[PDB]
């Protein structure tokens, strides 16, 4: 039968980052990842503080922050420790191994110094994971591979998706799961995170497609919903966050 | 591969009725300077980037940046780079590999600390998200008269940018030809002469690195496979004499181009 998050956290071959996430998910009754898609540091830290108790994870796009500094990220880490959530930088590493290693460790962002989780596209081959691993393994980090995408015309389907899964299984010391629209692996130690979620189905003007928490967690078997605009554009952001949390959590309970 | 006869020169392609103005500018610079070399300036310090640009600018048609590895990035460094690009006549290509939904990539191109759209002549995108990635970029880039390259093939071992994926890249380019000016690819992927083909994974001798990079010669990628421009990083920037390395790559790539004419 379907394992609970608490059970999965204790699997022999589970990743320590994966274990930590699943424990705080069970403990807090949230499988909600906030997509903190804002342009100001103050807004990012405000969201993290106000919605931290409602989320298992906060997803960042630091390259969209007009006033990024490393001190902003240290402050985010303080909030993540206080409220108990993981920080996931949605960087979509997608280059040869030698390049991505530098993009993950260095530059002005120093991503590996603050992100628990990053993600990678599998299009370059497994060298992308090999490069990131050289930096992330010593720092006890995790990685998610992009197996499916939520946008219209996505090419992350069929054999491409299957390749994502194979790559993830061959690098289980570093890769802890997937960005996907559905359960793509049958190994329960892998996490499935799903963007393209709003309470009601719909989309945007630029190819985003939305499905309900019930659809993606209940019917499609994913673990975590990633929600941006459904929360951050709402008149009341905490109310929105709690609505998504309840919807996603009840849909998970329904699978048990 | 089969190529039709009477191969067009870069100058001739610059005159085609449906050529993109950025492609036309690049093609004329290539013809004028006898270079189809793009330098991949994969350095950590702004000093190094600008010294490369100044010393190697006359040998190159294009400089490819990864500004997210630049430890001391500022917009002032980009202003200095643009002046060198004007003084030595080359385009600036930020190898950002935009690869997210349209709503997100629009902000990544225009915003944040890098403000990429304000300085890069060219950017590139992966086509995995569907055409929304190009539509989002285009909303920022077309008002600014910029161009875009789509990643149709990759140089690395295990690349999934093959077959139907490559074909989808070409179709997406055609659907957005007011903005997309060509491809990152290992070979000619479209017979349409208005499209540029840029090929990374190039060294004077075939080879590779320890993290999945594969190298082919300029003769192989330009002369045999029909690509237009070679993108070279370590082959030049890891050498003791970089100007000599750059000239060697320029000569090899240019002679290979000449070999396909008339
Ligand atoms: O396949 C994917 C992968 C990542 N994202 C990201 O997830 C968030 C979705 O936000 P929203 O559409 O809920 O505002 C955005 O940051 C977007 O970049 C997707 O939407 N779809
Ligand atoms: O398919 C691709 C796409 C882009 N690059 C980029 O081109 C340059 C190759 O450098 P090098 O291997 O010549 O040093 C790097 O900046 C790398 O990120 C590739 O190598 N292969």
Swiss-Prot record, chain B:
GO terms for biological process: 'de novo' pyrimidine nucleobase biosynthetic process; 'de novo' UMP biosynthetic process; pyrimidine nucleobase biosynthetic process; UDP biosynthetic process; UMP biosynthetic process. It comes from Homo sapiens. The gene is UMPS. Pathway: Pyrimidine metabolism; UMP biosynthesis via de novo pathway; UMP from orotate: step 1/2; Pyrimidine metabolism; UMP biosynthesis via de novo pathway; UMP from orotate: step 2/2. Homodimer; dimerization is required for enzymatic activity. The chain holds residues 224 to 479 of 480 of the full protein. GO terms for cellular component: cytoplasm; cytosol; nucleus. In the N-terminal section; belongs to the purine/pyrimidine phosphoribosyltransferase family. Bifunctional enzyme catalyzing the last two steps of de novo pyrimidine biosynthesis, orotate phosphoribosyltransferase (OPRT), which converts orotate to orotidine-5'-monophosphate (OMP), and orotidine-5'-monophosphate decarboxylase (ODC), the terminal enzymatic reaction that decarboxylates OMP to uridine monophosphate (UMP). The active site is at residues 95, 97, 100. Orotidine 5'-phosphate binds at residues 40, 64, 97, 100, 104, 155, 213-215, 233-234. Keywords: Acetylation, Decarboxylase, Disease variant, Glycosyltransferase, Lyase, Multifunctional enzyme, Phosphoprotein, Pyrimidine biosynthesis, Transferase. It comes from the Eukaryota. UMP binds at residues 40, 42, 64-66, 100, 104, 155, 213-215, 233-234. Residues 7-262 are annotated as: OMPdecase. One of its GO terms (molecular function) is orotidine-5'-phosphate decarboxylase activity. It catalyses: orotidine 5'-phosphate + diphosphate = orotate + 5-phospho-alpha-D-ribose 1-diphosphate; orotidine 5'-phosphate + H(+) = UMP + CO2. This is Uridine 5'-monophosphate synthase. Its EC number is 2.4.2.10, 4.1.1.23. It is linked to Orotic aciduria 1: A disorder of pyrimidine metabolism resulting in megaloblastic anemia and orotic acid crystalluria that is frequently associated with some degree of physical and intellectual disability. A minority of cases have additional features, particularly congenital malformations and immune deficiencies.
